[PDB]
Amino acid sequence: KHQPGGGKVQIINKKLDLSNVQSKCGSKDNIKHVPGGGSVQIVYKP
């Protein structure tokens, strides 16, 4: 919606973006894509 930088202008990326749900730079719990510094768990950057 606003992720494109303005509802009036759409970069189509909106579909990729969750939108307001995204809030944080990533999804909930950092998309749990933790590569290492994120929390060192999966340690396999998705």
Side-chain angles (χ1 to χ4, degrees), residues 1-2 4-5 7 10 12-13 15-16 18 21 27 29-31 34 38-39 41-46:
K1 296 185 185 81
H2 191 186
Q10 304 177 8
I12 312 309
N13 292 179
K15 291 132 66 88
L16 305 184
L18 306 185
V21 173
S27 198
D29 295 346
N30 305 136
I31 306 171
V34 176
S39 273
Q41 312 179 76
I42 61 188
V43 299
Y44 89 148
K45 4 185 194 309

Side-chain angles (χ1 to χ4, degrees), residues 13-26:
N13 292 179
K14 176 176 65 156
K15 291 132 66 88
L16 305 184
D17 295 346
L18 306 185
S19 80
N20 300 137
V21 173
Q22 180 176 174
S23 163
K24 298 182 185 207
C25 296

